[PDB]
Design a protein around this motif. Structure first.
Motif, PDB file in Angstrom:
ATOM      1  N   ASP A   1       0.816  -1.203   0.000  1.00 51.27           N
ATOM      2  CA  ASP A   1       0.000   0.000   0.000  1.00 51.27           C
ATOM      3  C   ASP A   1       0.854   1.258   0.000  1.00 51.27           C
ATOM      4  N   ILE A   2       1.996   1.241   0.682  1.00 53.28           N
ATOM      5  CA  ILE A   2       2.861   2.414   0.650  1.00 53.28           C
ATOM      6  C   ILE A   2       3.314   2.680  -0.773  1.00 53.28           C
ATOM      7  N   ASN A   3       3.680   1.618  -1.479  1.00 54.01           N
ATOM      8  CA  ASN A   3       4.080   1.782  -2.867  1.00 54.01           C
ATOM      9  C   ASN A   3       2.930   2.312  -3.705  1.00 54.01           C
ATOM     10  N   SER A   4       1.726   1.789  -3.476  1.00 44.80           N
ATOM     11  CA  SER A   4       0.572   2.228  -4.251  1.00 44.80           C
ATOM     12  C   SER A   4       0.261   3.695  -3.991  1.00 44.80           C
ATOM     13  N   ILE A   5       0.381   4.130  -2.739  1.00 44.92           N
ATOM     14  CA  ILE A   5       0.153   5.530  -2.405  1.00 44.92           C
ATOM     15  C   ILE A   5       1.102   6.414  -3.184  1.00 44.92           C
ATOM     16  N   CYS A   6       2.390   6.086  -3.138  1.00 49.24           N
ATOM     17  CA  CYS A   6       3.351   6.938  -3.821  1.00 49.24           C
ATOM     18  C   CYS A   6       3.074   6.978  -5.318  1.00 49.24           C
ATOM     19  N   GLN A   7       2.757   5.831  -5.912  1.00 55.13           N
ATOM     20  CA  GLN A   7       2.562   5.828  -7.354  1.00 55.13           C
ATOM     21  C   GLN A   7       1.324   6.619  -7.748  1.00 55.13           C
ATOM     22  N   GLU A   8       0.222   6.454  -7.017  1.00 53.55           N
ATOM     23  CA  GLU A   8      -0.965   7.224  -7.362  1.00 53.55           C
ATOM     24  C   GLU A   8      -0.751   8.707  -7.158  1.00 53.55           C
ATOM     25  N   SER A   9      -0.058   9.102  -6.093  1.00 55.34           N
ATOM     26  CA  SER A   9       0.153  10.530  -5.899  1.00 55.34           C
ATOM     27  C   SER A   9       0.948  11.117  -7.055  1.00 55.34           C
ATOM     28  N   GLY A  10       1.985  10.412  -7.505  1.00 54.70           N
ATOM     29  CA  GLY A  10       2.730  10.913  -8.648  1.00 54.70           C
ATOM     30  C   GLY A  10       1.878  11.009  -9.900  1.00 54.70           C
ATOM     31  N   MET A  11       1.079   9.976 -10.168  1.00 60.40           N
ATOM     32  CA  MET A  11       0.256   9.990 -11.374  1.00 60.40           C
ATOM     33  C   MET A  11      -0.782  11.099 -11.307  1.00 60.40           C
ATOM     34  N   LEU A  12      -1.374  11.297 -10.135  1.00 61.84           N
ATOM     35  CA  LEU A  12      -2.374  12.339  -9.972  1.00 61.84           C
ATOM     36  C   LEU A  12      -1.762  13.713 -10.157  1.00 61.84           C
ATOM     37  N   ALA A  13      -0.531  13.898  -9.690  1.00 62.75           N
ATOM     38  CA  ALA A  13       0.138  15.174  -9.904  1.00 62.75           C
ATOM     39  C   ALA A  13       0.390  15.416 -11.385  1.00 62.75           C
ATOM     40  N   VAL A  14       0.881  14.402 -12.097  1.00 59.47           N
ATOM     41  CA  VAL A  14       1.237  14.655 -13.489  1.00 59.47           C
ATOM     42  C   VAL A  14      -0.007  14.843 -14.338  1.00 59.47           C
ATOM     43  N   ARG A  15      -1.127  14.228 -13.953  1.00 60.28           N
ATOM     44  CA  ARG A  15      -2.302  14.281 -14.814  1.00 60.28           C
ATOM     45  C   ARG A  15      -2.765  15.712 -15.038  1.00 60.28           C
ATOM     46  N   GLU A  16      -2.754  16.530 -13.994  1.00 60.80           N
ATOM     47  CA  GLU A  16      -3.162  17.921 -14.108  1.00 60.80           C
ATOM     48  C   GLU A  16      -2.046  18.819 -14.599  1.00 60.80           C
ATOM     49  N   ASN A  17      -1.053  18.243 -15.274  1.00 60.01           N
ATOM     50  CA  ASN A  17       0.009  19.001 -15.932  1.00 60.01           C
ATOM     51  C   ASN A  17       0.766  19.888 -14.949  1.00 60.01           C
ATOM     52  N   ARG A  18       1.098  19.329 -13.791  1.00 65.70           N
ATOM     53  CA  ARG A  18       2.013  19.955 -12.847  1.00 65.70           C
ATOM     54  C   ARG A  18       3.269  19.103 -12.795  1.00 65.70           C
ATOM     55  N   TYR A  19       4.393  19.690 -13.185  1.00 63.88           N
ATOM     56  CA  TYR A  19       5.629  18.935 -13.315  1.00 63.88           C
ATOM     57  C   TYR A  19       6.151  18.413 -11.986  1.00 63.88           C
ATOM     58  N   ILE A  20       5.665  18.933 -10.865  1.00 66.40           N
ATOM     59  CA  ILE A  20       6.198  18.579  -9.558  1.00 66.40           C
ATOM     60  C   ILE A  20       5.038  18.317  -8.606  1.00 66.40           C
ATOM     61  N   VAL A  21       5.215  17.338  -7.712  1.00 66.70           N
ATOM     62  CA  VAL A  21       4.205  17.064  -6.696  1.00 66.70           C
ATOM     63  C   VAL A  21       4.046  18.291  -5.817  1.00 66.70           C
ATOM     64  N   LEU A  22       2.818  18.565  -5.379  1.00 66.21           N
ATOM     65  CA  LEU A  22       2.569  19.718  -4.529  1.00 66.21           C
ATOM     66  C   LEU A  22       1.976  19.379  -3.170  1.00 66.21           C
ATOM     67  N   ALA A  23       1.823  18.101  -2.839  1.00 63.97           N
ATOM     68  CA  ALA A  23       1.386  17.606  -1.537  1.00 63.97           C
ATOM     69  C   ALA A  23      -0.051  17.953  -1.192  1.00 63.97           C
ATOM     70  N   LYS A  24      -0.762  18.687  -2.034  1.00 64.14           N
ATOM     71  CA  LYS A  24      -2.203  18.769  -1.861  1.00 64.14           C
ATOM     72  C   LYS A  24      -2.882  17.519  -2.372  1.00 64.14           C
ATOM     73  N   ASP A  25      -2.084  16.512  -2.704  1.00 64.41           N
ATOM     74  CA  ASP A  25      -2.559  15.243  -3.207  1.00 64.41           C
ATOM     75  C   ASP A  25      -2.088  14.047  -2.395  1.00 64.41           C
ATOM     76  N   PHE A  26      -1.095  14.209  -1.515  1.00 67.41           N
ATOM     77  CA  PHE A  26      -0.759  13.122  -0.604  1.00 67.41           C
ATOM     78  C   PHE A  26      -1.920  12.789   0.313  1.00 67.41           C
ATOM     79  N   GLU A  27      -2.595  13.799   0.855  1.00 64.20           N
ATOM     80  CA  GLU A  27      -3.788  13.491   1.634  1.00 64.20           C
ATOM     81  C   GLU A  27      -4.893  12.942   0.744  1.00 64.20           C
ATOM     82  N   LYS A  28      -4.938  13.372  -0.514  1.00 56.77           N
ATOM     83  CA  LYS A  28      -5.919  12.838  -1.444  1.00 56.77           C
ATOM     84  C   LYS A  28      -5.729  11.340  -1.627  1.00 56.77           C
TER      85      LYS A  28
END
Lengths: 270, 73, 239, 65, 50, 230, 159, 139
Positions: free
Chosen positions: H95-122
């Motif tokens: 699950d830790i791996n899944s969390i990290c991968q989804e957060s990265g994918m969710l960040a890139v989907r909205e065309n933000r080149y860098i994670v912004l942590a408003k999605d780690f809680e997401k």
């Protein structure tokens, strides 16, 4: 190939495919992506990003350092729509998507599937746009874990894309649905009236008439008619024009078609 | 899938042998058209009607479909 | 899977008996959905009506039944079982009034129904009467009360209730809605109910196919809203 | 639940949709089972018309005798 | 067959610390490690029999 | 083929259905009970599945008389019935002898009525386990009763999910004598070892049985006891 | 705490020692200041020698770090800065600015001396490749250091 | 019938691993779930000497997993992962791996080149609520 007498290795010969897998290669560029279908605009938006974006700039997600995302899992009722959607999007860009047939069969298929797919993915490497569509499913668990573990695990494949289609909720398999391989889940649903209208008119396109048609009443009368059902009612109206050796379909032929087809639907509802 | 005639020792092709010598004789009897009559059948009148619709008319009236714009089964 | 208890009411391995779940999902063949909300001086129930033919009358379809002068009820699931259930409830209320001399509160009546269903499922030979229960009523020093009974003998009372086919969506929508502020005003309750049903069904409502029922401290008497006043409410909320 | 049978179904299924669109040959398939549905899907133009057969009705027996 | 287990386990305890001795504490700890069982912690399964 | 019935024996050992009933019991919400030198403390968890449910409607800790408290673990609906049964049993005893019933008597009568349902086929056993607390004759008492019919006494125990960890931690922590407040503190902290999430004042029910009676604590004292400490 | 320091003395696992140190600090939160602060220094030291020095400044900006700001954290910050710039003289002068702060405590000066020697080794090896014969005072001028210690270091090298 | 086939397979494995003909310089690795139900013919020493546990992670383990997985990633934020570490939610490494991968994918989907942590809680609420509401009466 070996010489007739000295038994020396003159030349190597290419290796082909076992039957059925050979058959399952077909393509249809006629259906434009998100267009030549009826008009399932609600789900049109989702499909494009998941597939095209990885291949248009994989370097971005390699900037973030994430494993390549994969195509979505499709979930529907009749099974008609999934095929058209995959064909349409393949038609827009893909040169020849290779699709494989899925069905429920019990045992000893681990190698049968594994070497099949390994070599098919080699064939997908042969031409880069290839998409390896998988059809609806529904011993088992061995082949499921083998597929997931191997194909995505030794993957290393730079340009090949994946789409999986299934009806109903099957046995527990989170490891298949875990993020990065089957992240995006879609839920096709039965045909709305107003999309149905376009679909049935498209089918009526080649059918002759004299403009008397009242499509709005036809819509108001019956529902639950998937695209195949609409094809059926249009065909039955054609048959009701064949009745009594007529020439031009009349609205009453559409009424008779609606009646009969909806009855044959209700009858033997199995 | 073409049949061919080949030399025994060298496997070079010598003739194409396109003459039909395929499979075994079955169903290829011209002895008689079958003899059943619809009067011999009870009850299934609707089934024979649907069957005539599905085959007998297409076998003769393809043009009605063509100019109606429909493809028969 | 396997079905140790698929046929009768006994314990499977892992201690989960399987008939009551079938009873639970037997609630959806009604093909309806209802919502209930509570405001500081009001209680509101909303539901929709399906009339598939014109030969059907209009006054013999309502699912809103009167329990007593201050207690009202709404039904889901199948039909006949609901009628048996309400007959039992009326009998219970009358007996309570005759025995004790004052009025039945909603709590005790709900507990009586729950106990009936529990005893009904403890033994065999009786099919556990698959219908859900929702009641509202006004009492003093507590105000408006809304409660719901479960075919397995469970009961609880709570602020926003949904039942039927689309509970998983209507309840979530109500969760999002209520968190910001409490639905203080009387008409905000009707607002929220109509909007919830409209959004979950993705369609607006012709007035002739909606049934609502409200009770207020001003008049605890049960009352059914007529066509004209629901027209006024809808056009007020839908400008 | 045999390696010949899949190949034969392939032959049938491929030649099924390889027919001339003009369509002057006809095909009649009259089986008593619908016990499986994997072979020869009945939708999407692979196959078309279906017919059910009832068990003999009241008139059926009198007529047959 | 687990007397061999006791001996080998004491040996590995000696090896992990880079030593050639064998003392008695090593044997005792090997004894504890090899002998292992479990019981019904439910305490209800046990009590229904008097 | 030695299952699905309660009127026959297994080819080797003992009955079958009761084990499944106990397994269903172990799947319920956790709870803990601690005896003190001069009182008894029962604590249990109360989890909502939303924000719509009202915490004030249904209680978990219930009083039997002025001095006997009852808590349970297992499934829900099968709890009210035998609570009501215990109430009326106590009333009958009071009518007969004009004096409050000692706790042991009530426990054994409850055990008998609870075992009544196992013999014969056509009734399924109760899937609930009970803990009973009382103060009598200058001495606290705590008892446990099971669906089988047996009953027995604890010094401090817990049941429900992860009861193994609770038992380990209590044997790890529990001393022999303390006061009520120390027992309350240790009960609260020992149930922290589960219940994923913060513990608000409305998700925990704590009842006490002291010399002057059995009383459930108001939410004020609860949030006070969990505030800034434990 | 002591598990962390023992794993540190092994000089082979500079990541788990970080874990035990951070846990020890979290335990000492707002209840034992004199131990929490020294845990902070050891934590930052563990961060230094894994060659990720900017994280030191990232960490001292944390929510709990602002409570315990002082003088020694400045010393660790400047040491990280000098190590990043690879300036030997800057490193020595930075140590000179702080004598009682980090120079003279156990299990701090030892690792610092080790890192200092390794850095000096890298600097000497970086400026020999072009030449096949060169006098040493020129080398000292390039490296910004004296001549005697350079001779001693080269001798120890070539032994 | 056909139960004896399974039992015969097990007997053959036991015979082959420690039988008449001893072989040297071979090893065996076995991995399963909980091992209370294993046949004690396997478990006697001389045949399966070492028995090893892989329990659920605790705070320290979760800290290590998170730091290791993130170090590969282009996160680059002034946000504290340890806030998610201190959560008392029982969780596994996958699950830790899944969390990290989804957060990265969710960040890139909205065309933000860098994670912004408003999605780690997401993503954290996304995977933590991976639960199904039981029927109310079990509770």
């Amino acid at each position: 190939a070996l010489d007739m007498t000295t038994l020396t290795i003159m030349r190597y010969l290419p290796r082909e495919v076992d039957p059925l897998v050979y058959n399952m290669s077909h393509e249809d560029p006629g259906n434009v992506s998100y267009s030549e279908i009826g008009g399932l605009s609600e789900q049109i938006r989702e499909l494009r990003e998941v597939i095209e974006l990885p291949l248009t700039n994989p370097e971005l997600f390699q900037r973030v350092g994430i494993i390549p995302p994969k195509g979505c899992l499709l979930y529907g009722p009749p099974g008609t729509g999934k095929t058209l959607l995959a064909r349409a999007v393949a038609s827009q860009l893909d040169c020849n998507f290779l699709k494989v047939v899925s069905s429920s069969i019990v045992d000893k298929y681990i190698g049968e599937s594994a070497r099949l797919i390994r070599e098919m993915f080699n064939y997908a490497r042969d031409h880069q746009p290839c998409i390896i569509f998988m059809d609806e499913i529904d011993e088992i668990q061995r082949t499921l874990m083998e597929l997931l573990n191997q194909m995505d695990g030794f993957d290393t494949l730079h340009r090949v894309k994946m789409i999986m289609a299934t009806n109903r909720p099957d046995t527990l398999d989170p490891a298949l649905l875990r993020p990065g391989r089957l992240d995006r889940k879609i839920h096709i649903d039965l045909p709305n009236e107003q999309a149905r209208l376009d679909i049935l008119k498209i089918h009526a396109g080649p059918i002759t008439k004299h403009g008397e048609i009242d499509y709005e009443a036809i819509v108001k009368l019956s529902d639950g008619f998937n695209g195949a059902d609409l094809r059926n009612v249009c065909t039955e109206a054609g048959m009701f024009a064949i009745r009594a050796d007529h020439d031009f379909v009349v609205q009453e032929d559409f009424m008779k078609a609606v009646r009969k087809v909806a009855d044959s639907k209700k009858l033997e509802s199995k | 899938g073409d049949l061919v005639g080949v030399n025994k020792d060298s496997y070079l092709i010598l003739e194409t042998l396109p003459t039909e010598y395929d499979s075994r004789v079955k169903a290829m009897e011209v002895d008689e058209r079958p003899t059943e009559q619809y009067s011999d059948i009870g009850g299934l009148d609707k089934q024979i009607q649907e069957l005539v619709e599905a085959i007998v008319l297409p076998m003769n009236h393809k043009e009605k479909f063509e100019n109606l714009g429909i493809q028969p089964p | 899977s396997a079905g140790f208890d698929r046929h009768i009411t006994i314990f499977s391995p892992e201690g989960r008996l399987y008939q009551v779940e079938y009873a639970f999902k037997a609630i959806n063949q009604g093909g309806l959905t209802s919502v209930a909300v509570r405001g500081k001086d009001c209680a509101v129930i909303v539901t929709q009506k399906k009339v598939p033919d014109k030969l059907l009358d209009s006054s013999t379809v309502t699912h809103l039944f009167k329990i007593t002068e201050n207690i009202g009820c709404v039904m889901t699931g199948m039909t006949a079982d609901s009628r048996s259930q309400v007959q039992r409830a009326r009998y219970e209320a009358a007996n309570w009034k005759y025995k004790y001399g004052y009025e039945i509160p909603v709590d005790m009546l709900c507990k009586r129904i729950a106990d009936i269903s529990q005893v009904y499922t403890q033994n065999a030979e009786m099919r556990p009467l698959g219908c859900c229960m929702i009641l509202i009523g006004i009492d003093e020093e507590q105000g408006p009360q809304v409660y719901k009974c479960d075919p397995a003998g469970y009961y609880c009372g709570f602020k926003a209730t949904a039942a039927g086919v689309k509970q998983t969506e209507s309840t979530s929508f109500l969760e999002k809605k209520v968190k910001k502020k409490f639905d203080w005003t009387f008409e905000q309750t009707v607002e929220t109910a109509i909007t919830c049903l409209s959004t979950v069904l993705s369609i607006d409502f012709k007035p002739s196919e909606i049934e609502v029922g409200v009770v207020t401290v001003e008049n605890p008497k049960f009352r059914i809203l007529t066509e004209a006043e629901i027209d006024a409410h809808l056009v007020a909320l839908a400008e | 639940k045999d390696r010949e049978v899949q190949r034969t179904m392939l032959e049938l299924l491929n030649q099924l949709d390889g027919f001339q669109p003009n369509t002057q040959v006809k095909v009649i398939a009259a089986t008593n089972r619908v016990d499986i549905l994997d072979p020869a899907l009945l939708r999407s133009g692979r196959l078309d018309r279906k017919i059910e057969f009832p068990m003999p009705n009241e008139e059926a027996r009198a007529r047959i005798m | 067959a687990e007397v061999k287990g006791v001996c080998t386990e004491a040996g590995m305890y000696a090896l992990r610390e880079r030593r050639v001795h064998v003392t008695q504490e090593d044997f005792e700890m090997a004894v504890a490690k090899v002998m292992q069982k479990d019981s019904e912690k439910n305490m209800s399964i046990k009590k229904l029999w008097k | 083929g030695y299952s699905f019935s309660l009127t026959t024996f297994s080819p080797s050992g003992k009955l079958v259905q009761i084990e499944y009933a106990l397994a269903a019991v172990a799947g319920g919400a956790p709870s803990v009970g601690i005896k003190a030198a001069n009182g008894v403390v029962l604590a249990t968890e109360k989890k909502q599945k939303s924000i719509l449910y009202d915490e004030r409607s249904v209680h978990k800790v219930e009083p039997i008389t002025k001095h006997i408290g009852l808590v349970y673990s297992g499934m829900g609906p099968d709890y009210r019935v035998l609570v009501h049964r215990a109430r009326k049993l106590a009333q009958q005893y009071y009518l007969v002898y004009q004096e409050p019933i000692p706790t042991a008597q009530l426990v054994q009568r409850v055990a008998s009525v609870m075992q009544e349902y196992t013999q014969s086929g056509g009734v399924r056993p109760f899937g609930v386990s009970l803990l009973i607390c009382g103060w009598n004759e200058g001495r606290p008492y705590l008892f446990q009763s099971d669906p089988s019919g047996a009953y027995f006494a604890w010094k401090a125990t817990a049941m429900g999910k992860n009861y193994v960890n609770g038992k380990t931690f209590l044997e790890k922590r529990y001393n022999e004598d303390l006061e009520l407040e120390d027992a309350i503190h240790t009960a609260i902290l020992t149930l922290k070892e589960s219940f994923e999430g913060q513990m608000t004042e409305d998700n925990i029910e704590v009842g006490i049985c002291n010399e002057a009676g059995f009383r459930r604590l108001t939410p004020t004292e609860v949030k006070d006891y969990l505030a800034a400490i434990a | 705490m002591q598990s962390g320091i023992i794993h540190a003395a092994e000089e082979k696992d500079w990541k788990t020692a970080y874990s035990y140190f951070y846990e020890a600090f979290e335990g000492y939160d707002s209840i034992d200041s004199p131990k929490a602060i020294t845990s902070l220094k050891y934590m930052l030291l563990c961060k230094i020698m894994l060659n990720t020095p900017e994280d030191v400044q990232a960490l001292v900006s944390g929510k709990l770090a602002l409570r315990y700001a002082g003088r020694q954290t400045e010393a660790l910050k400047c040491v990280a800065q000098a190590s990043k710039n690879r300036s030997l003289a800057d490193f020595e002068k930075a140590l000179t600015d702080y004598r009682a702060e980090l120079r003279d405590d156990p299990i701090i000066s030892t690792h610092l001396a080790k890192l200092y020697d390794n850095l000096l080794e890298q600097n000497l090896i970086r400026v020999i490749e072009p030449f096949s014969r060169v006098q040493i005072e020129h080398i000292s001028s390039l490296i910004k250091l004296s001549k005697a210690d350079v001779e001693r270091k080269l001798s120890q090298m070539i032994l | 019938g056909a139960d004896r086939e399974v039992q015969r397979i097990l007997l053959e494995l036991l015979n082959q691993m420690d039988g008449f003909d001893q072989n040297v310089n071979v090893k065996v690795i076995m991995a399963t779930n909980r091992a209370d139900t294993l046949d004690p013919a396997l478990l006697r020493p001389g045949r399966l000497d070492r028995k090893i546990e892989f329990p659920l992670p605790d705070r320290r383990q979760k800290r290590l997993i998170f730091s290791t997985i993130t170090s590969k990633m282009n996160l680059s934020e002034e946000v504290d992962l340890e806030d998610y570490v201190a959560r008392p939610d029982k969780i596994s490494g996958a699950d830790i791996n899944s969390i990290c991968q989804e957060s990265g994918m969710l960040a890139v989907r909205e065309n933000r080149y860098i994670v912004l942590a408003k999605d780690f809680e997401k993503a954290y609420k996304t995977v933590i609520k991976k639960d199904e509401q039981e029927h109310e009466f079990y509770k």
